[PDB]
Structure formats: structure tokens, C-alpha cells
Amino acid sequence: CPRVQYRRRMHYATRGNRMRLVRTPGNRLVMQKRGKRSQGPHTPWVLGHKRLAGTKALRHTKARLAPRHQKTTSRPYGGVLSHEQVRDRIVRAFLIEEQRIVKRALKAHAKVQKEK
Amino acid sequence: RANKTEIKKAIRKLYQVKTVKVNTLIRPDGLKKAYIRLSASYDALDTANKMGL
Amino acid sequence: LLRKYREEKKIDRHIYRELYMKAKGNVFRNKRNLMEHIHKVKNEKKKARQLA
Amino acid sequence: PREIKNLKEFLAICSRKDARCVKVKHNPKVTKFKVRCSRHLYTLVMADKKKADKIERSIHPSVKKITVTSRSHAN
Amino acid sequence: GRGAPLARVEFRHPYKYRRVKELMVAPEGMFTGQSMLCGVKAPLAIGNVLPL
Amino acid sequence: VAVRAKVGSRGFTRQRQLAKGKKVFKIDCSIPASDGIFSDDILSNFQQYFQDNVKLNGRKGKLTSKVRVNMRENTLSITTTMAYRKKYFKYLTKKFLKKKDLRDWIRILAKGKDTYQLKYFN
Amino acid sequence: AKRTVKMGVMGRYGARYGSNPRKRAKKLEVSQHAKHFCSFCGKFAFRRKAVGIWRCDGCSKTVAGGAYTLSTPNNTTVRSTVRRLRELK
RNA sequence: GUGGAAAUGCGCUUGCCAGGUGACCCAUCCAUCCUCCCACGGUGAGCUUUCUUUUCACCAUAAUCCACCUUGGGCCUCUCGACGCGUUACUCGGAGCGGGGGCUCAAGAUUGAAAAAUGCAGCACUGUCUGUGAGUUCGGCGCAUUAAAGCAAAAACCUGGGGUGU
RNA sequence: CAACUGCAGACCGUACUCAUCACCGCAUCAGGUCCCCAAGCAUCGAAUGCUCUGGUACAUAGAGAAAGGUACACUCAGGGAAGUCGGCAAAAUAGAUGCGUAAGUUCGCAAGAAGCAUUGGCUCUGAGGGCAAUUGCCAACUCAGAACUGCUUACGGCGGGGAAUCCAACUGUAUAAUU
RNA sequence: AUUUCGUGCCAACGGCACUCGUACACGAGUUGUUCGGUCACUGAGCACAACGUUACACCGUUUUGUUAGGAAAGAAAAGGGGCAACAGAGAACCUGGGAUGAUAUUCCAAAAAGAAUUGCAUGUGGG
RNA sequence: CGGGGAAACCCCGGUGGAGGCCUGUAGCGAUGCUGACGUGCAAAUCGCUCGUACGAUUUGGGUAUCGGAGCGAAAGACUC
Ligand SMILES: [K+]
Ligand SMILES: [Mg+2]
Ligand SMILES: [Mg+2]
Ligand SMILES: [Mg+2]
Ligand SMILES: [Mg+2]
Ligand SMILES: [Mg+2]
Ligand SMILES: [Mg+2]
Ligand SMILES: [Mg+2]
Ligand SMILES: [Mg+2]
Ligand SMILES: [Mg+2]
Ligand SMILES: [Mg+2]
Ligand SMILES: [Mg+2]
Ligand SMILES: [Mg+2]
Ligand SMILES: [Mg+2]
Ligand SMILES: [Mg+2]
Ligand SMILES: [Mg+2]
Ligand SMILES: [Mg+2]
Ligand SMILES: [Mg+2]
Ligand SMILES: [Mg+2]
Ligand SMILES: [Mg+2]
Ligand SMILES: [Mg+2]
Ligand SMILES: [Mg+2]
Ligand SMILES: [Mg+2]
Ligand code: NA
Ligand code: NA
């Protein structure tokens, strides 16, 4: 029986203009706008587009007013990388530096040994 | 060409009343109309009688 | 039905896997068809175990 | 709207000097005290009929208190 | 509009504290994560850029 | 649903019953007994009219004494342990009123739980 | 060959476009939709995504390959030539 | 600043650099809100030559906030697998399946404040409900399929690397 | 720096219409004009027919079997294309289910090829599930079968088929107003 | 672009009729911190400045990171100033009303019928 | 998932839902009656019938190319 009308002043069904049907305490059926949804923080696109854990998906106004720990974790590269990618960088930093130290010593020792 | 803030200040100077809201519209014939709500401490009927309405 | 029998341990993981692929393979017509097959398989296992 | 949990929280709120009025609602089997401060309406719900009167008489005389009743169109 | 895939390569700026991103036509066998060497003293491998 | 139905069982239906029992419905005729609109004879057949017309388990006229109709002090009280709708006795009262040609003189309303009364209107 | 005797994947074209044009396109259509061996992780998981772009489901690597097949016979010859010329120094 | 072995939880400021949201609209399947039927009940009208525990109408809860069981996904830990888990469906696993215990994201559910003081129908007062089935693109499978067809951009905002301060 | 509190929150649009009468066609013209919401029954159904809510009785009317007309109206004995440049127009087939289906072929099709049978009403039977402790309670209409009984072949909606020759491979475009 | 509303009116007009009217006359009606737009984004694109050409600017270039032989920044930073979307991006408010003749997520007054959310400055308490 | 086979490999039944695929609404068109009208409802319309209807598809707003010129799946088509 009931049929509804747009209540704001845009009458086109686009992705940014989506409505839900609501019954009021006065026994009426009206249109109420439901907002857009964000996808939330992600890892960098070149490293795979993976959704981060411990972070909420908030729109522009909600993200500004939210507490800080709702968008981050308390570890290095908190709201940017995942725990697998943080481990890769730490291992890469230590192991590669070790090879440079080892190969520098070998080159110096071989030169001294050759000269004598 | 007047705005709401200027209208509110002009009313107090002319009639010595304090307002709480001003609403304006531009009529189809080009004139501008304003609805002015006075504070509860001031009687709109008393002011209109003094004006001569 | 197959998930319930595995949970209740009336069936084991070896028979469950074999019957799972046969159900997807259009072997059992309805629930009664599956149940009679399970009893037939279980009875044969009893005979083999008692022979061991 | 916010809910007060215990009495000592209610006494602080009712003494905040920001309360315009206190509305008392006499529901069946419960009584509610609704304190109208700025930006928020704080409510305190009591399931015990007695000592709900005690709070009503022991409220600050300075603050305005009203009994909520059913008003008609002409009322 | 183009038949050949393109590659995004990332370098360091020689003189400033920033990163430079380039876009080139990709040779066959190029993969993500590969190291590109450009210059006179670069070795002879697929995907490297050398003087003729 | 679970059991497919048959035409042979159409005539009879299960009445169902209450666990606690002793549910009473009252119809009050104090307003027209106050005036001369009603009569003692009309009250007498009113007792009989409800007695033979109220159905039980799909059949009418045979009461297993689980439904009691007796009325006292110008109030017809039905006491039963079988499930019933309060609206049913309002429907039966309307049938009686029409048969006696009094539909335009008496209207029936409800006060509370299991109570009906007859009043005039103007 | 239960559903179709010889048309194969080209059975979606009905009775249009001619038998020999359909045969020529069938060979390249099959390999373009096949799964190719990944040398980085040892899985048959390479699939095409737009012409010349291949992505592995296992290790999530992307490789520049050839149109309708992961590696072309000309590429195999080139890799051997370059390896020999590098070893020559 | 700080808690936990871990997933990760709880409570000063940014010349420069780096990421993210914005941001990309799906057949099929499942599905909220919603409306459409049934079963039970309350209220009011309708038909009644004869039948009809019967026909019709109504039975409503806005935004915002507090506290914290279902479904789907990601991950940690213990026990470390060749056969095993799983979809209607074209999958997957020593580059770590499955089972026990956990951390987290999304969509819902539940208790409460708002809020009966409102709304509806009958005549000052009365009544003021829940459970099933079908349909329906919010959301999910970051989804199949043609592709020599394969991500519009930017403002604004968010987090971190360094540095400063305590 | 997080709470609370006090004060202040500028400008323009806002009536009505959106069409068998409010716009464009000289007009209140059977033409044209983008978007959202969309009930019940029959039924595969946004087909087609009828209906609750909402909306309308506004389009010059009255009397009234001349001929000849137009029609989104029909029927005709016997024959059955003899009519005509030409089966033009009309008639005709028709849903669903079971069986059955040729030449030719690029092996995909041709194909609903062609053709045969059944179908109403009423009273029953069987199969296809869920949850709690073998029992109890509960939900959805689909399919198959039987006895009895009847026909005046009885809404709407819904392919006529076959054998060949010429041309163009195919889907598509294209002389708004004679191709 | 006043056809909306009330009261009156029947000369002409609504191809018949009118006591009716979107006709005629006289008076009324459109209320926003949150709705749409500007403020305040880029796109297909446009073309001020600068330069060049033309007897003559009323011509050409002006987004493939981007003007101009080019000194266009008022503590380092290369590449002038703008416009173009009322269906793309962006966007802090919801119900009830006995509140109209005509407006309402725009009106309601101290029990605001009320319940909220957000932008500026202030003041207190923690400091 | 079942069969057959020494191998190479070959068969049945399900599932799945492809296609400038088919019947058919809305939409987009315009074959026949050489029907109606032909001082018309209309300076091209009306009625039945008919083509297509997931694609080289239909459509709103914005933007870009014009008179010795523009644009054209090409008809001397169209450019108020
Ligand atoms: K044929
Ligand atoms: Mg305004
Ligand atoms: Mg093994
Ligand atoms: Mg093993
Ligand atoms: Mg585990
Ligand atoms: Mg409209
Ligand atoms: Mg018209
Ligand atoms: Mg049916
Ligand atoms: Mg229909
Ligand atoms: Mg229709
Ligand atoms: Mg004849
Ligand atoms: Mg002749
Ligand atoms: Mg014909
Ligand atoms: Mg044949
Ligand atoms: Mg047939
Ligand atoms: Mg052709
Ligand atoms: Mg023509
Ligand atoms: Mg006239
Ligand atoms: Mg917009
Ligand atoms: Mg706005
Ligand atoms: Mg077709
Ligand atoms: Mg003609
Ligand atoms: Mg010619
Ligand atoms: Na076609
Ligand atoms: Na541009």
C-alpha cells in the first residue's frame, strides 16, 4: 500500500545516494539516507592490497574525531605495515649489513696477506 | 541588501528590545520580509501598541 | 548428515572423505539412500576387524 | 541522553549548578529522575519506591522540580 | 591502446632526499622485485640498460 | 502441512483446552433491565439461545458439561476449560439481537478482561 | 570428449565464423586460459590478466610474458645467448 | 607513556620524506531494512430468508548514545599433516592442512537511556501482538564470464620513518 | 592538552506545474519529452484479464433498424485458389507432458524438423525435511499413481508446415517525409 | 513564472454549455548553523598573462608535469593567474504537533513537544 | 563419481552456466495491408501485423569539429 518519495533534493539513484525505508512512531514510511562506507586502512598496493588489523574503517569526519589508537597498533610501522612485513625489514636490515662487514674484512685481509 | 546580523542590531537601536531569532525571505515582488522573535522578557504586543499598530 | 555423523564419531575421517566425494558425484538419491549405505559399509568394517 | 548509575553520581550532577529543572516520572514499579543540564539529559532510575520519596524531599530547594503528567491539546 | 606491458621502476634521487618513479617498456621475463642496473659499469643481464 | 488433510475430517475440529482452566466470560444486561426494553421472557430464551447455539469441537447442541451457561443477576456467565475467543460470544450476541429485531436499539461494548455489556445509543 | 567431439572451447560460437579460423583461434585460446608452471615457487599457478601480464596465485608475483603464453620460444633462445656472452667476460 | 610469549590491548608537538582513505559500481548464491501472505490473540465495524467459533480494518517506535550471543573473513599459539578440509559452483595445504585455545575486522542480534510524557481506535476511561513462509542488490564471496576491452583524477583527511620535548 | 561551561552561528534558492490542459509543436493539438516509489488473484509472468487504496465520470449532446461507408466486430449450405500480375486479405497452427524425429553439414547444427498420444471434477495413496529427548512436535508445495464421475471440445494468452532455384557468408548499418 | 490561496464576478474567452474555471477583479502566501548551491575538488575541455605572427588582433600556442630567451616565490621550496559537474568527489538533524486558507527535516519557548550533532572565540576546574 | 584398457587413451551419469545464441515484455525501429486519414488529431499521424531486444545496445547532462565548410558502417544522408 505505501509508496515513498525522496526527502532531500537529489532524485537519482547513484552509489552516493542510497536510502533505507523506516517506519516512524507516527505510523509512516519515510526514506532515510544511509551514508557511504570506507574500506579502511590497507597495506601498500605494491605489496598486496591487504586490510590491516586493529584499525577501524572510518569516514573523513569520524576519523578526525576518533581516538588515535583506533587507527593504529603500538608497534613500529603501526598503521602502515603488517607484522609479516615488519619482520621482513628487520631481518633484511641485520643480515645484509652482516655480509658487508664480513666481505670488507675478507678484502682487507687478503690484500695484507698478498703484500706479505 | 541587509543581512540577518544587521537587522538584529537595527531593531534594538530603534525599539529597545532584545531578540532571539531572525528569519528572512525575499518576496516574489522583490521586497525582503523578516520575522523577528523577541525575548521572553519583552512583550511583542506591548511593543506593537507603542509603535501604533 | 555426513557432518553430524563425523561429530558423533559413528563415522571416521576415512569413510567421511569417500562418501563426501560420492555425494558430489550423484550417487545417493536422498537421505534414506545415504543412511542405508553407511550401515552397509559399517557392517563390513566390523567383519574385517573381527577377522583381524 | 546519559544514564546515572549510583546515588553519589546523581548528587554531583544535581549540584552542577547547570541544571535548569528536574523532571520526576512516576512509572509503574519504577521512578525516574531526569536532570536537564546543557547538552545532555541525565536520568536516574530507581526500582525501590521508598527512599525515592526521600530523595524527592531532600532535593535542593533552589532547583526547580516538576511532576510529569499526561498534557492534553488544550492543556 | 598499447600491446606491450609497461613496468614501474623506483630509483633514489641522486642529489635529494626523495624517491623517483619511472615508467618503461618491459622486456620479457621482467618480474616484480627484480633489480635494474643502469649505467656504464652495469653487467650484461636481461633488463639492464647499457651503452651500446 | 506435516500431515496432508482429508475431506472426511472436515466436519469436526479440535477445540483445544487450557492448562489452568476455569476461564469465565460475562455478558451484562443491566442497562436494558433498568428500563422496559428487555423482558424476563426474553432473558429466559436468551439463556436457551446461548445454550443450544454454542458449538463444541465443531458440533452444536451437544455440551459435555465442560461449558456452563447458567446466568444469575442479569449476567450471563460462560465458564469453561476449553479454548475460546472472546469475540465469539459478541458474534453470537449480534446474531440473537438481529433475530429479535433489536439491532438498531442495542449495542455491545467491552470493559476489560472477559466482560461485555449492552447499552443504548443516541 | 563427452559433450563435444572436436569443437572444445570454441563450441560457444555456434555455426559461425568458419572451421579453419576457429581451429587457429582454439590453440591460442586454450593456452591463454591454462595454468603455467611458476619457477619462483614451484607451482602450476600462473594465469593471464590482460595481454602479456601473468600473475601467480601462490606467491603473488607478476611477470611480463607473451600475449597467449607465459614464455615464447624466442625468449628462451635469447636468455641462453646473453648468459654465454656474460660468461665470456 | 604503558600491558601481553604472540596475534595485539589501554591511556606533548611536526621543516622533510613514505604509505593509506577518497577510489572505481558483476551473472549466480546467501542476505539486512522493507512489503506480502499465513497461525494465535485483543479492539471496532459488516452480513444474518438460511448458513458462517466467520468477512474487513488496526495492533506503531525517529536520530543519537551506553554495556556486551550469530554469520563471514584475516591472523597468533600449542599439537606439527600425504592424506585431509571445504563450496550450488570452476579450490586449497611443510612457502604450514586439520583439531584445542585465543587476537582482530565487517554485518547483524540482545539489555538499557531517549520513550510513553508520543501515536492510533472506541466511549472520564479502556485496548495498544509474537512466531513461521515467499519476495526484494544494503552488505558478502576483494566473486565466475568476453577481453588484441583489463583501477578516472584531485582537494580534504588518517597513520607512520626521522627529529624535537619530558 | 583532554572535559565542562557562556556566547555567536553569514549569503542565495524554497509558492505551483512537470503534462490526453501549466513545456515544444501558430492552440487546453490522439505527436514528442530524463529520474525515484509500485498492492491482491489467475499465470512461467512488469504478458494479458479482473479488483482494495489513491484518482476520475472531462472530452457537444438527444431521437433513432434508408442507401453507401469505417471498424483495434462476427457467422455462413455444397465445392475448395476455379479468383488475382501474384493465396493480397482472411482462415489456419498454438500451452504443457511422454514418445519420436530426415536429407545436408564447417560436426556446432539443421530441430519446436516432420509426427503420435494425454489433459476436466471429485475422493484417496506414495516419495521428496527440521528440532528436541525409538518417541513427540512442526513447515514447503512439487512430482508420480488409483477408483468414481462428466463433456455442448467451451475465458485470456500462445509457432502453420514441407520440397527446391537465385543473391548476400553470418549479428549489424542505411535514403527523418514514396526505395 | 504567480498558473498557488481566499473572497467576489459572468461582458469577452475554455470551437456545445456553465451558476464552473489555469478566465476576469481585489487582496494574500515561499521563514534553514545541519536541505541544494557558493564558500572549498579535479575531468572531457576553455583561453587572461607572456611570447610570436599579421597592412590590421577580432589570430596561434597555452596538461605527454603544466606558461613565457624565461630574473613571474614577498626559510627551503623548479615549472604565472583563473574557470568548467545543482546525477562524478564533498556534505554536522531526527521524530511529534490542535503549527496554515495557502510554507515546512525551514514554524513550536521555559516542562522550548522535544532529543541531538558539529564550526569559532572565551571562562572555570584538572594545571 | 562410476566403467573399459598392457599402454596410448576411450565411454556413461551428474554439476556448471558460455554465446555480436533462440522465443518473448519495457525500450529502440518501421515490413505489409499499396488499411484509416488525405481542407487530417497530425505541414508524416492513427490501427492491426511486423524487426531486434547482453550488445558494433538504449538514454540524461557536459564538451569538441561548420558553409568555396563540417560530419558520414556512403543514401549526393544530415548540419533548427
Ligand atoms: K527444414
Ligand atoms: Mg533562506
Ligand atoms: Mg603418504
Ligand atoms: Mg607421512
Ligand atoms: Mg588453529
Ligand atoms: Mg512526474
Ligand atoms: Mg498532447
Ligand atoms: Mg498457481
Ligand atoms: Mg500483470
Ligand atoms: Mg501491462
Ligand atoms: Mg462456405
Ligand atoms: Mg482467370
Ligand atoms: Mg498474409
Ligand atoms: Mg541424420
Ligand atoms: Mg512438436
Ligand atoms: Mg546480409
Ligand atoms: Mg523514405
Ligand atoms: Mg463555448
Ligand atoms: Mg553529488
Ligand atoms: Mg548542504
Ligand atoms: Mg531474437
Ligand atoms: Mg494507403
Ligand atoms: Mg546517385
Ligand atoms: Na541480434
Ligand atoms: Na584539463
Curated annotation (Swiss-Prot), chain B:
Coiled coil: none annotated. It comes from the Eukaryota. This protein binds to a specific region on the 26S rRNA. Belongs to the universal ribosomal protein uL23 family. This is Large ribosomal subunit protein uL23. It comes from Trypanosoma brucei brucei. The gene is RPL23A.
